[PDB]
Amino acid sequence: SYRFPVIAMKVKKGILSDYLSLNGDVDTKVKADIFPDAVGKITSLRIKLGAYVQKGQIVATLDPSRPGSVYLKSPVRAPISGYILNITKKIGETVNPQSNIAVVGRIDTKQILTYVSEKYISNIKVGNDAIIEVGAYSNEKFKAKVSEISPILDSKSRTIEVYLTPIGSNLDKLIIGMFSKIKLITKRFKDVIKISREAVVEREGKKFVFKVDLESKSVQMLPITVLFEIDNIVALSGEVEENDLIVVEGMSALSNGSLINLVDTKEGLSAESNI
């Protein structure tokens, strides 16, 4: 007793990656709005979301109709072949030839569009890896690669368009028209000691961590350099080796050489990338 207790980490070398948090939409390179030829009322829908349609195929029907006439017309036809990606009108609604009824296009030319601000663009290059996230779980995250950076800077919004091509499998669930968080990876620090942000401790205008010595059951305060910090993880360099025991809870009470009580040893952070 009179000793300060702890939980430590079995520290490991790994990869900490820098990334930009962006927002983007799932688009397709080949799509088109279905516009009617006549003004009038929707009498039937012969399409469902998901349906493949031939160019010129009848998709919706209208009133025959007017007083009148003399051009009694005209069904709605698909402007190109493809899949129905959206339906924007229902039975009963009236439509002019500038009324978007639905969208058709290809499901195999998926593309993520995102507008990177002027101040962040510099660190981006074609071939960069990215994670497209629509949710928190494994089925809701997909891999991608930067395909194309526009040379044009929209002087209005101060942004450059970056396009990303998704890769891997599960891409079925990456649905066209969806919103996505994008994590665009600009760099990776390989072969660095990774530790939770908490273990790092500012005392006297300098950062340290606490290495545990199992034989003497006490700690040593070592000066450390933070190389990079992200996701509440820290990459560092120092006289910390693989498998050293560094404290990840209870550093408020400690000084250099203070005795301790090791309650449990947490397993190290993944040797592979944070993202």
Residue numbers in the entry: 43 to 317
How do the authors describe this structure?
Periplasmic adaptor proteins are essential components of bacterial tripartite multidrug efflux pumps. BesA shows the archetypal linear, flexible, multi-domain architecture evident among proteobacteria and retains the lipoyl, β-barrel and membrane-proximal domains that interact with the periplasmic domains of the inner membrane transporter. However, it lacks the α-hairpin domain shown to establish extensive coiled-coil interactions with the periplasmic entrance helices of the outer membrane-anchored TolC exit duct.
Density for this loop is visible only in the C2 monomer where it is stabilised by the loop of a neighbouring monomer in the crystal lattice, but high B-factors here and poorly defined density for the P212121 or P21 monomers indicate the small loop is highly flexible. In both the data-based assembly model of AcrAB-TolC and the in vitro co-crystal structure of an adaptor-transporter (CusBA) subcomplex tripartite pump assembly is facilitated by the flexibility of the adaptor’s serially-linked domains, which was confirmed by MD analysis of the closely related MexA. This ‘hinge’ flexibility at the inter-domain linkers is also evident in the BesA variant space groups which show movement of the lipoyl domain, relative to the other domains.
